[PDB]
Structures are given as structure tokens and as C-alpha cells.
UniProtKB/Swiss-Prot annotation, chain A:
Keyword terms: Acetylation, DNA-directed RNA polymerase, Metal-binding, Nucleus, Transcription, Zinc, Zinc-finger
Stated name of the protein: DNA-directed RNA polymerase II subunit RPB9
Organism placement in taxonomy: Eukaryota, Metazoa, Chordata, Craniata, Vertebrata
Quaternary data: Component of the RNA polymerase II (Pol II) complex consisting of 12 subunits.
Residues that coordinate or bind Zn(2+) 2: C75, C78, C103, C108
InterPro entries: DNA-dir_RNA_pol-M_15_CS, Rpa12/Rpb9/Rpc10/TFS, Zn_ribbon_RPB9, Zn_ribbon_RPB9_C, Znf_TFIIS
Zinc finger (TFIIS-type): 71-113
PANTHER family per the UniProt record, alphabetical: DNA-DIRECTED RNA POLYMERASE (PTHR11239), DNA-DIRECTED RNA POLYMERASE II SUBUNIT RPB9 (PTHR11239:SF1)
Role according to the record: DNA-dependent RNA polymerase catalyzes the transcription of DNA into RNA using the four ribonucleoside triphosphates as substrates. Component of RNA polymerase II which synthesizes mRNA precursors and many functional non-coding RNAs. Pol II is the central component of the basal RNA polymerase II transcription machinery. It is composed of mobile elements that move relative to each other. RPB9 is part of the upper jaw surrounding the central large cleft and thought to grab the incoming DNA template.
Family that this chain belongs to: Belongs to the archaeal RpoM/eukaryotic RPA12/RPB9/RPC11 RNA polymerase family.
Record-level Gene Ontology MF annotations: DNA-directed RNA polymerase activity; nucleic acid binding; zinc ion binding
Main subcellular location of this protein, as a coarse class: nucleus
Subcellular location: Nucleus, Nucleolus
Curated annotation (Swiss-Prot), chain C:
Phosphothreonine modifications at: T114
Post-translational modification: Phosphorylated on Ser and other residues by TAF1 and casein kinase II-like kinases.
Protein name (database record): General transcription factor IIF subunit 1
Biological classification of the source: Eukaryota, Metazoa, Chordata, Craniata, Vertebrata
Naturally occurring in which organism (per UniProt): Homo sapiens (Human)
Superkingdom to which the source organism belongs: Eukaryota
Gene: GTF2F1
Induction description: Up-regulated in response to enterovirus 71 (EV71) infection.
From Swiss-Prot, chain E:
Function: TFIIF is a general transcription initiation factor that binds to RNA polymerase II and helps to recruit it to the initiation complex in collaboration with TFIIB.
A molecular function GO annotation: RNA polymerase II general transcription initiation factor activity
Name this protein carries in UniProt: General transcription factor IIF subunit 2
Subunit structure: Heterodimer of an alpha and a beta subunit. Interacts with HTATSF1 and GPBP1. Interacts with URI1. Interacts with GTF2B (via N-terminus); this interaction is inhibited in presence of GTF2F1.
Source taxon at top rank: Eukaryota
ATP-binding as UniProt keyword: no
Organism: Homo sapiens
Length: 114, 176, 134, 707, 113, 48
């Protein structure tokens, strides 16, 4: 799923097929450096696009003076009783009125939806 | 705009004044003849039967794997159904293509149009040729996957870029 | 250790003259070049530009050896001069001015794709994909 | 020490301090004093000498002087003209202009003979009234009445052939920044732009696009690979792939190119998108053949090879991104910026950042009298040097000698400025067809509030009949900087606009003091730092140019704030934006940004204690005024861009009380929310009780009331 | 013996050199180097958890500059020469980089406050 | 109240944030009339 760079000329390693041992070989076009593939899959295309933005929001958003705050929902990892919540603010806005939270305690940065 | 979408007023007038080919929202109103005009279910079935539906609307994700042998089954759990096909092995005519294409489907978007991968399976074959070959699961299994390989008669221009071209071509030119 | 408790004081001089101009020769750490493998080197100004401005051409090991190209930095004394500080047998320090900064990079002596030929190849390949469709 | 509910009389005592010092037309008077103290000295000083030839000669200009406006009588006796006689006798209010020229002859005749002629006459410049160069500067009311002048007259206009002309501020798209749009009609699926100009020194402004072709291209040649990133450089005919123009700067390898464009190699989704960009630039794989490829299609197709490799060298060196650096050295910077321009185009295709807004008022700049007369003075100083040659060559081929007092055609600058100001078309006399019209109209003197509402007026240069509504509708960003109610009806609805009461336009400065701070806080150099270790760093821009990186932003932010509060090193006009999400920091110092003062708020209390009020109601015999209020860190000018990273409270006694509260991290507070109205719309009693279109009619109707 | 021939002795000796950044006004003071070229004396104090280097101007040159040590990691640095006889020589590899700064550069304290 | 609902009457007067939204609505209602005249005049001339 990732990418492979050549170890000699630092370029993009293409996948190739050899008719001897039935194993995927990654080859270079400039040089002909070789090696075998460990996962033996090339292409993947996610159309659902249901990526949870809990992996994209940053912990320093709790320094924003223009975001609402809450005393109801406390943090689990530290027990702080003050959070700051917001919406998806991104694409995939068909049914996007969820409410992600971020703890505001210094050096906690814990994030969670509900 | 204060009133879905309809054009009225003076712009609709000069759309009538001239007969310019481009109405800003062409729309044909349709009426229904049989009890289908009465019950909502037949209305909805003819609704789905009239609307255009492509492939990328009924797929979840696709992946190009590499099975040099159909018994290799790089992904862990698809071995069961591909094997119960494999004890009934047909079409090993020229070779077996080491390049595989795996497609995952969303039963939500599948059933809403009253589709299941049987009709898809024949028409993705009947309509494109026979250069492709589709084996599939049973829908009792929760996730609906069907795997495709090129017809090995071609192996006796790279097949990887060709398979990516075909993958990027079928999801938009499906015509379900 | 002496890096922790070490103490000392040494005199610094800045001679108004030198017998040779001093330049910096910089290498990417990521390459981790073994200088011991350099049995010999040749060093000449680059010929693409057909002097003091010329980029350097470094050829390691005389005949059979490595090769790098050195490209001059934009500035070296535009705001602050750079000095080479060297330890002398008397313990006193000697400072040497940096005349220039040259950037040295590794070279790929493999593969030669050709212009007009490459473009012609691309069109045929582009044409081939369009042909035999549906 | 706090101010509880004495607020209604306290807010009107700081606003009085503002207008007692600044005034209402400081907009006009400050951009002029700039154009004539700095922007005119730099133009003649930064001009190429005219070495010409056997012997050869030298000429270079050193220093500029001016004298007070003067009128030459019928028999040649000068006398200072007062602004009143200029109105009565249909004169023109202008001042003569001198210069020092030095001339050295170089014939290697065993002697270098140099000589200079100082204070040489050049021409005459109009003078804006009440400036620092007028005859009315710093006079008292007993003397203003003695010259038959009104002590209430604001100033800020020219007198040209008896008439009274006023210059209208023109709007303009901001420069030196990257904007991402999407033309949904043409071949492109996305587009970037960057208008560059190297610090007020270029007549044109080179613009460069970085496109991306559409997905639904009918054709299997591209159905599988995908869209290819393209670029449309200036001074060339054909489109160019980006990898080609990357190699023309060196960087032929594809591990070095793909680290200027992608800053972290754990991202497969982006690398897949840049892969089909290499496939078409694969066969052309070295520098010199690349320069030939771009060099083959220019304003002149090269017949030979060396000229194309020469032609492609400077166009890629003096017309590509001149704001980064124009020297032939330092070409690693033109690579990073061109990489950031492309890295930002991909983020707009994966849907990770939103597209830019055209009418967002943080992307606009304003051209006052300063940046308008300076643009018109370049094209007439070059035109004056272009015709000293034509007179020198004709006169030195005969080998006699040279004399310069007869070479200078003085009618070039005098009649050049006076023409375009009097008639309006912003061009030349033989260029009455290629110029921008509508500038420099006649002052309106129907009633005293129709005069003030004329010296404060903007104008967006879009057409006057286009039916597109988005350049006409009211944007929310106009809060507090443009009057929302005052606009004319007819065909010019929303095209001309008046600015609010406390809105202040910046004048410009140099960023060198901030650069000293950057070394003081050890901002990391872009070249010095590892390219790989850049993702975990906040790219630091200054005035549009990427100038390094830095890994400690939060400490830097508090530090920048304290520096602003003292204001010792940085002027209030500068704006410093930090966006946490995109992980960068911007700084601006140029002229044209629009500001307005606000009240600084600490933890939850104002910084304006009572000690500041009981000593501010005494300005008459205490010498404590608005300036001593900014320099104490209780108010602060806030730009439009910076106004997106702020949290405002409308009123202290009501929004900064601890409770179950809306917010708790207020950063600023307004003075009085009634300063969001223009000049003609702030004479309406109870304007918050009428229907909205009614307030628009009166503001366009109190301009024609007799008084 | 050839013009394009580079001496590798320094490198092969693993010869080390020090690199120090110096302000121009100080460097202008240094162009007026006392005597043959002496400019002053360098003082080095190292402790168990702190190391201090500074330079003090020659009394003649006067008529404390602390050093800031800078990393040389990420890029290998060596010094190479061109004689007045145009012979080429590699003197050494850079083992230290540094930047002397004037002490107490005005307010900084005010900025911190 | 945060997206345009003016809950006062013209008599009791409007608060600043409501006075701004009212101005916006009035402005669009004022532009449409400026367009309409030219459009209808031209189309009628053609047809006649
Ligand atoms: Zn390789
Ligand atoms: Zn927490």
C-alpha cells in the first residue's frame, strides 16, 4: 500500500513479475535494483471514505479562544472536567453533525467522539 | 428561489423567447398508469428502475492483489469460497493470470436498488467481452466481495496498467 | 570525564594573510561517505559552463573512482564571515577565513534517456492506449 | 481601579482622543508624504547609469531636492503662490524639482576627469494641500484666516488648472500569496496563482499558474494514469509539465524533486497523485535538453541552440517568482516555493483544505495617492533617460563634446503628471485608449458633509454593468471597515463604497527590524534545516516569502504579543497571523492593508484601568494623548486577516462576567459598536429602528442638501 | 602533480577544524589585527553540566564575546584550499561550528517581560 | 437569533446585530429591481 524507493539512485520502484518462482519483484527503471514484496498487494481504493477525523484533529485546538466549552463531559484519561467541542468542518458533510471533543487540560490532548 | 428547482419569471421567459438549446433545468414530469400510481412500493421500484446507477455508487473499496496461484489467497479469509470454486475448477485454458482484482460492495446501496451481485456478475461479463472472469461469495456472508482475473488466453503492453485502466473504466461506465 | 570537568585557555590570532584561499567542502551526512575509500581525487572546475565562480568537479581515485558536483552557495559573507579555527602545537588557536561555500552532491553514472526520442516514444505509447478500445 | 458601569462616558473619552489627533483625512495626507520623501528618492537612485561611447562618459543621479510652490511672473521674477490665487487665476499648485548629477569621462587618457552639476532642474510636481510640503503646514487659525482660508477645510486634494481634484482609492487583489480556485468551464480541474513584484521596482507584475488537467478527459491514453500537473510560465507560448521546469533548475533526480513537493513519505494517497506526473517527463532526463524544451517556445523561437539555452536561462531567472529573489544565485529558494505552490494544489484535490475566496476582504489591497503617483513617476523617469541617450549619441558621433543642461527635456515630468491628473485616464497622452479611467474626479462642494464623504471613498475596478452579484453583495468581513448602509443606486450598486469612521489604512515599512528579532529568537533557516525534518515544523513566511522554519510557535506567539504591546521594535500596523491547523505563521509589512483599533483583554478583565481615564480627560495641559495610549499596550490595531484568529466581546460590562457563559477566552473588546457606520450614515437619529433600504437612501440624499 | 589534482592529506589525516561565525563590526576590528595578526585570547571553561567558551579582545585590538556552539550534524563539512600557486589541498574536516554574539544585546529582557 | 431572526418590532427598535442582517436583506431586495428594468425593456423591444 505504501511506496518503495531504490537503494542506489533514490527513485520510484515499480512492481514486476518473474516467471520462475511466482513472487512479486520490485524493480527500478533507471537502475535494475531488485527485491521481493512482503505483502504482495499493489492497489487499494477506498470509496466509502469513512475515515474518522479522530486521526486528523490536533491536540492544540484547545488553545482557541473562539470555540465553545463544556463542564458536563469530563475527560476519561485524566479526569479534567472541561472540554471544547466542534463539528467535522470538512467534506463528507451529508450527515455530519457529530460533535468531537478535546480535553483542555495542559498536556492531555485526549480526543473522543460520542 | 423562494418556492426543488424550477425556472420561472423573466429568465424563463427569454428561455421561451428564444428556443436556445440550454434550459437551466430541463426536467420531464412523469405520470404512472397502473396500481403503481397508487401504492408507493411499485412507484419506488419503477423509480429505481428509471434512475441511472453506476458502479462506484455500489462499491466500498477495491484492491489489486497478486495471486500467482488461485490457492495462494494472500488475504486471509477469502480462501473458503474461492476454494469451494476450486474443487470445481473450470477455465484454466491457457494460463492463470497472477494479477487479481478484488472488489468490495456495500449491501446498503445494493438492496436499495434491489440489486445483488448475480445480475452484476453476468452483465460485467455479458457486455464487456469474456476477457474477464468473476467468482463471488454468497450474500449470506455479510460483506459482498467478487474477485476477477483477466482471461489467461492473452498471456500466450503490461497487464498491470491495463488492469488499472479497466478498474478506473468500469466504475464510471458501468451502466447498471 | 574531561568533557565535563575539562578546562583550558588558548590564544587566538587572525593573520592578515594566507598562502592559500580557504573554502568549505560540504557533504550530505545521509551518504556517510568513507573518506578512507578515497585513495585519490581529482578536482577541477565544471566544464558545462564551457573561473573563480565555476562549480567544482570532484573525481575520486584518479581513473576509476567516484564523482561529485559542487555548486556555489548564494552568499558566505553577506552578513557574517565564516572562520576556520585550527589548533597549533603551542596550543594557541589560529583562525582562517572562509572564502566560499560549495555544495557537493553524488552523481548517477547510469541510464541515458534521449529528448526527441523520449517524446516520440511517449506519443506512441499514448496512442497505443487509445487504440483497440471496446 | 476598574471601570464599573461608568462605561458610557468612558468610551466617548477615548474616541475623542482618537479624532483630536488623527482626524478624518489622515488617509490621504500620509500616503503622499511617503511618496515624496522615500518613494521618489528610490526611483532615481535605483536607476542604471548611462555609460555611452574612443572615449566614453558617465552619468548618475545622487540626491533630490524640492522647494516651496512658486509662480514665475510675466517678467521672470518668482514669488510663492498661495492656494487662493491658484483658484482665482486658474493656476496650478506645484513645486519645482532638482537633482545632483555627476559626470565622469573615461578615456583612459592617463586621467579620469569627473565633474558634477548639482541642483539641476527637472520638472514640477503637484502638491496636495495641507501636507508637509504645502505653504499651509502647521499654521494657526489667526494666520489661516489671514490668507483667506477656512480653518475647517480638511485638505487632501490637488489644485490643477483652477479645479480641485481628488484621487479615488482603487481596490486590487493581494500579491505574493497563493490562491486556489476551480474554473468549472475550462480544461482545468484546479488552479493556483501568485502575482509577484520585487519590492516596488517593476512596472509589470509577473503571474504564474500551476494548473491540473481534468479527470473526465475522453481517451484511454490518460484514462488509466490520471491528471497531469501543468504550468503556464510567462513569456512562453505552450504549457509545460512541472517536472521539466524543476529539472531546469538542477534537481534532475526524482528523489530530490519529490522531497520539495511532498514533505512526508508516510503518505501514500498523495504520492499516488504525483506519480502520473513523472511518466510524461521521463524521457527528457537532463538539464540542458530541458532548457531547450522550454527555450524552444518563447516570444522568439530560437534558430540556434545556444540562444535558446540562453533565452530559457533568464526567463526562468528574472521572470519566475521575482519576489523570492532575482539574483542568479539562491535558486534553491525558487525550488522550495515552487514546491510549496504544488504541495498546496494537491491538498485542494484530496479535499484537505478549502478553496480560497475571491471577495474575502482579507485578500485585497488599496492604492492611495502614494502607490499611484509612484507608479506614474517610473514610466516618466525612464522615458526621460531614454531621451538623453538619443540626444547624446547624435551629439557624440561628431565627437565635439557633451552638454547635459540642454539634454533634459523638462516638459516630460511637468506635463506628464498634470495631464493624467486633470483628465483622469491613468496613462499617457498618446495612450488615451490603453489607460484605466475613472480616477481623479472633481471635489464635491455642495455641503460640508458631501466634501468629507468624497475624500473617503473606495472603488472596485470591475465593470459597471456586469450582472454578476458576488462582487456586489455585502460580505460579513466588511464588519467595521466599510460602511454597510451607504452605497449609490442605479448601475453602480455596491461598486463604490465608503469606509467606516475609525478604519485606518496602513502606509508600509521594511521588515529588517523583524528579521533581527527572528535571529534573536533563533528562527531556523530553511536551507540550514533538514528537508525531512520539516513536517513537524511551522513554516514561517514574511511578506509572502518563505524564510525558514521554527519548532516553538506558542512561546513565539506570546513573545510577539509582548513586543507589540511595547511596540518598541514593531509598528502597530504590522499584522501577525498564526493558523494552528495548517501549521504556519504569516507576517505582513506592506502598504494597503486596512486596520481598526480594539481594546486588549487579559484573563477576563480589560487592560484600561481608571488611571488612564482621569489623566486622559486632561490632554489640554498634560500632553497625554492617543499616542501615549498605544505605546502603553491597552489598544491595538487589528487587520482583517488577523481578525480571523481573534475572539471579540461587544461590550465589557455585559460579556465579560463569569457565569454559565458563551465563551471564556475573550481576546479583545470593542470601543463602541457605533463606529461601524460611514460619514453620511452617522447623522441619522435612531438608525436601528428603520427598515434597511431606508438608511441607504438618506445616506445618498444628505449629500445634496443645501446648507 | 597537476592543476586539477586535489590533496587529500587533511581528510586522510582526519584533520579537524573549528567553524566560528563572527559579526562584521568585530570582523572589521579584526582586519586591524594587532601585531602579526593577533586579535586576542580565547577562554574555555567546562563543567560537569555546563561548558563555557568565550573570546576576549586584544588590549591593542580594543583601541567578552561568548561563543554559541552550533551543530554540524546532517551535513559533513570539510575545508579545501587553493594556493597562490593554484595548488589544491584539503586541510581537514570540520569538527566544530560556532557563532559568537555580543553580550547583553540591549533589551531582550524587556521582550521577555 | 444568531442567524437572522429579528424578534423586535420596528417600534421597539432593533439591536445592532439585527440592524446588520436587516440591511443585508434590504440590499439584495434593492439590487433585483435595478436589474429587472433593463432586462424587460430589451426583451419587449425585440419581440415587438
Ligand atoms: Zn533505482
Ligand atoms: Zn484530559
Amino acid at each position: 500500500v505504501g511506496i518503495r524507493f531504490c537503494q542506489e539512485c533514490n527513485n520510484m520502484l515499480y512492481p514486476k513479475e518473474d516467471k520462475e518462482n511466482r513472487i512479486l519483484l520490485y524493480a527500478c527503471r533507471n537502475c535494475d535494483y531488485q527485491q521481493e514484496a512482503d505483502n504482495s498487494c499493489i492497489y487499494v481504493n477506498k470509496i466509502t471514505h469513512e475515515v474518522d477525523e479522530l486521526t486528523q484533529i490536533i491536540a492544540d485546538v484547545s488553545q482557541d479562544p473562539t470555540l465553545p466549552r463544556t463542564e458536563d463531559h469530563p475527560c476519561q484519561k485524566c479526569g479534567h472536567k472541561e472540554a471544547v467541542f466542534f463539528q467535522s468542518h470538512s467534506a463528507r458533510a451529508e450527515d455530519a453533525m457529530r460533535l468531537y471533543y478535546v480535553c483542555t487540560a495542559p498536556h492531555c490532548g485526549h480526543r473522543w467522539t460520542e | 428561489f423562494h418556492y426543488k428547482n424550477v425556472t420561472l419569471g423573466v429568465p424563463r421567459l427569454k428561455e421561451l423567447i428564444n428556443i436556445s438549446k440550454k434550459p437551466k433545468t430541463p426536467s420531464l414530469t412523469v405520470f404512472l398508469l397502473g396500481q403503481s400510481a397508487r401504492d408507493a412500493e411499485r412507484a419506488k421500484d419503477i423509480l429505481c428502475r428509471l434512475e441511472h446507477t453506476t458502479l462506484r455508487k455500489v462499491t466500498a473499496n477495491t484492491a489489486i492483489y497478486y495471486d500467482p496461484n488461485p490457492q495462494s489467497t494472500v488475504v486471509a479469509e477469502d480462501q473458503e469460497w474461492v476454494n469451494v470454486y476450486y474443487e470445481m475448477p473450470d477455465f484454466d485454458v491457457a494460463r492463470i493470470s497472477p494479477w487479481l482484482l478484488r472488489v468490495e460492495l456495500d449491501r446498503k446501496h445494493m438492496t436499495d436498488r434491489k440489486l445483488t451481485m448475480e445480475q452484476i456478475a453476468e452483465k460485467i461479463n455479458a457486455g464487456f467481452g469474456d476477457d474477464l472472469n468473476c467468482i463471488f461469495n454468497d450474500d449470506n456472508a455479510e460483506k459482498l466481495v467478487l474477485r476477477i482475473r483477466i482471461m489467461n488466453s492473452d498471456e500466450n503492453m503490461d497487464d498491470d496498467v491495463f488492469l488499472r485502466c479497466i478498474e478506473s473504466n468500469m466504475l464510471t461506465d458501468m451502466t447498471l | 570525564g574531561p568533557s565535563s570537568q575539562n578546562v583550558t585557555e588558548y590564544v587566538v590570532r587572525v593573520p592578515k594573510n594566507t598562502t592559500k584561499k580557504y573554502n568549505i567542502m560540504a557533504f550530505n551526512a545521509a551518504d556517510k561517505v568513507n573518506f578512507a575509500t578515497w585513495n585519490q581525487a581529482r578536482l577541477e572546475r565544471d566544464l558545462s559552463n564551457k573561473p573563480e565562480d565555476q562549480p567544482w568537479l570532484l573525481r575520486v581515485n584518479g581513473k576509476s573512482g567516484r564523482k561529485f558536483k559542487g555548486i556555489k552557495k548564494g552568499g558566505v559573507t553577506e552578513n557574517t564571515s565564516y572562520y576556520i579555527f585550527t589548533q597549533c602545537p603551542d596550543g594557541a588557536f589560529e583562525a582562517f577565513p572562509v572564502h566560499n561555500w560549495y555544495n557537493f552532491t553524488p552523481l548517477a553514472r547510469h541510464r541515458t534517456l534521449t529528448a526527441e526520442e523520449a517524446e516520440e516514444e511517449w506519443e506512441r505509447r499514448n496512442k497505443v492506449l487509445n487504440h483497440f478500445s471496446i | 481601579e476598574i471601570t464599573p458601569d461608568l462605561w458610557q462616558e468612558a468610551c466617548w473619552i477615548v474616541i475623542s482622543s482618537y479624532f483630536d489627533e488623527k482626524g478624518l483625512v489622515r488617509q490621504q495626507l500620509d500616503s503622499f508624504d511617503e511618496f515624496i520623501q522615500m518613494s521618489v528618492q528610490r526611483i532615481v537612485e535605483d536607476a542604471p547609469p548611462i555609460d555611452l561611447q574612443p572615449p566614453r562618459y558617465l552619468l548618475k543621479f545622487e540626491q533630490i531636492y524640492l522647494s516651496k510652490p512658486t509662480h514665475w511672473e510675466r517678467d521672470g521674477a518668482p514669488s510663492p503662490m498661495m492656494p487662493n490665487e491658484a483658484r482665482l487665476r486658474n493656476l496650478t499648485y506645484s513645486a519645482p524639482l532638482y537633482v545632483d548629477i555627476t559626470k565622469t569621462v573615461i578615456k583612459e587618457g592617463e586621467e579620469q576627469l569627473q565633474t558634477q552639476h548639482q541642483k539641476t532642474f527637472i520638472g514640477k510636481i503637484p502638491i496636495m494641500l495641507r501636507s508637509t510640503y504645502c505653504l499651509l503646514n502647521g499654521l494657526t487659525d489667526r494666520d489661516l484666516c489671514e490668507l483667506n482660508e477656512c480653518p475647517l477645510d480638511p485638505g487632501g486634494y490637488f489644485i490643477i488648472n483652477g479645479s480641485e481634484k481628488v484621487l479615488i482609492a482603487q481596490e486590487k487583489m493581494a500579491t505574493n500569496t497563493v490562491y486556489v480556485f476551480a474554473k468549472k468551464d475550462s480544461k482545468y480541474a484546479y488552479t493556483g496563482e501568485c502575482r509577484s513584484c520585487l519590492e516596488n521596482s517593476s512596472r509589470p507584475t509577473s503571474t504564474i499558474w500551476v494548473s491540473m488537467l481534468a479527470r473526465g478527459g475522453q481517451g484511454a491514453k490518460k484514462s488509466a494514469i490520471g491528471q497531469r500537473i501543468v504550468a503556464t510560465l510567462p513569456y512562453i507560448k505552450q504549457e509545460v509539465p512541472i517536472i521539466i521546469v524543476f529539472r531546469a533548475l538542477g534537481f534532475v533526480s526524482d528523489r530530490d524533486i519529490l522531497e520539495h513537493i511532498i514533505y512526508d513519505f508516510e503518505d501514500p494517497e498523495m504520492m499516488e497523485m504525483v506519480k502520473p506526473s513523472l511518466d510524461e517527463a521521463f524521457v527528457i532526463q537532463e538539464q540542458n535538453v530541458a532548457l531547450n524544451f522550454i527555450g524552444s517556445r518563447g516570444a522568439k523561437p530560437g534558430v540556434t541552440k545556444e540562444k535558446r539555452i540562453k533565452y530559457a536561462k533568464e526567463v526562468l531567472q528574472k521572470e519566475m517568482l521575482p519576489h523570492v529573489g532575482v539574483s542568479d544565485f539562491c535558486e534553491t529558494k525558487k525550488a522550495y516555493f515552487l514546491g510549496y505552490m504544488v504541495h498546496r494544489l494537491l491538498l485542494a484535490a484530496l479535499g484537505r483544505r478549502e478553496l480560497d475566496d475571491r471577495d474575502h476582504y482579507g485578500n485585497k489591497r488599496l492604492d492611495l495617492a502614494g502607490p499611484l503617483l509612484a507608479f506614474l513617476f517610473r514610466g516618466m523617469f525612464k522615458n526621460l533617460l531614454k531621451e538623453v541617450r538619443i540626444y547624446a549619441q547624435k551629439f557624440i558621433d561628431r565627437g565635439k563634446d557633451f552638454n547635459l543642461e540642454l539634454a533634459i527635456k523638462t516638459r516630460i515630468i511637468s506635463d506628464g503628471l498634470k495631464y493624467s491628473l486633470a483628465t483622469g485616464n491613468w496613462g499617457d497622452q498618446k495612450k488615451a485608449h490603453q489607460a484605466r479611467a475613472g480616477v481623479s474626479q472633481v471635489l464635491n462642494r455642495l455641503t460640508f458633509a458631501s466634501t468629507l464623504s468624497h475624500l473617503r471613498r473606495l472603488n472596485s475596478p470591475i465593470g459597471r454593468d456586469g450582472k454578476l452579484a458576488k462582487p456586489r453583495q455585502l460580505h460579513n468581513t466588511l464588519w467595521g471597515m466599510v460602511c454597510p448602509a451607504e452605497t449609490p443606486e442605479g448601475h453602480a450598486v455596491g461598486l463604490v463604497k465608503n469606509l467606516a469612521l475609525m478604519a485606518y489604512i496602513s502606509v508600509g515599512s521594511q521588515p529588517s527590524p523583524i528579521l533581527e528579532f527572528l535571529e534573536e529568537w533563533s528562527m531556523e533557516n530553511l536551507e540550514e534545516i533538514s528537508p525531512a525534518a520539516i513536517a513537524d515544523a511551522t513554516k514561517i513566511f514574511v511578506n509572502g516569502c518563505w524564510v525558514g522554519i521554527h519548532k516553538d510557535p506558542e512561546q513565539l506567539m506570546n513573545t510577539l504579543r509582548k513586543l507589540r504591546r511595547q511596540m518598541d521594535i514593531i509598528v502597530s500596523e504590522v499584522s501577525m497571523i498564526r493558523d494552528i491547523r495548517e501549521r504556519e505563521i504569516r507576517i505582513y509589512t506592506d502598504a494597503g492593508r486596512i486596520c481598526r483599533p480594539l481594546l486588549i483583554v487579559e484573563k477576563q478583565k480589560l487592560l484600561l484601568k481608571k488611571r488612564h481615564i482621569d489623566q486622559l480627560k486632561e490632554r489640554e495641559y498634560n500632553n497625554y494623548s492617543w499616542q501615549d495610549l498605544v505605546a502603553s499596550g491597552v489598544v491595538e490595531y487589528i487587520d482583517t486577516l488577523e481578525e480571523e484568529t481573534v475572539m471579540l466581546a461587544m461590550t465589557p460590562d455585559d460579556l465579560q462576567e463569569k457565569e454559565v457563559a458563551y465563551c471564556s477566552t475573550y481576546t479583545h473588546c470593542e470601543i463602541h459598536p457605533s463606529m461601524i457606520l460611514g460619514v453620511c450614515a452617522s447623522i441619522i437619529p435612531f438608525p436601528d429602528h428603520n427598515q434597511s433600504p431606508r438608511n441607504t437612501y438618506q445616506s445618498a440624499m444628505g449629500k445634496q442638501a443645501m446648507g | 602533480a597537476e592543476r586539477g589534482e586535489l590533496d587529500l592529506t587533511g581528510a586522510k589525516q582526519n584533520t579537524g577544524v573549528w567553524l566560528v561565525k563572527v559579526p562584521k563590526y568585530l570582523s572589521q576590528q579584526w582586519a586591524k589585527a594587532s601585531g602579526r595578526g593577533e586579535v586576542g585570547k580565547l577562554r574555555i571553561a567546562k563543567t560537569q553540566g555546563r561548558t563555557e567558551v568565550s573570546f576576549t579582545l586584544n588590549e591593542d585590538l580594543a583601541n567578552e564575546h561568548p561563543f554559541v556552539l552550533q551543530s554540524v550534524g546532517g551535513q559533513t563539512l570539510t575545508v579545501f584550499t587553493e594556493s597562490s600557486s593554484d595548488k589544491l589541498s584539503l586541510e581537514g574536516i570540520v569538527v566544530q561550528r560556532a557563532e559568537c554574539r555580543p553580550a547583553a544585546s540591549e533589551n531582550y529582557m524587556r521582550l521577555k517581560r | 437569533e444568531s442567524r437572522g431572526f429579528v424578534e423586535n418590532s420596528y417600534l421597539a427598535g432593533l439591536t445592532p446585530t439585527e440592524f446588520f442582517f436587516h440591511a443585508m436583506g434590504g440590499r439584495e431586495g434593492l439590487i433585483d429591481t435595478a436589474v429587472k428594468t433593463a432586462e424587460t425593456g430589451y426583451i419587449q423591444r425585440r419581440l415587438i
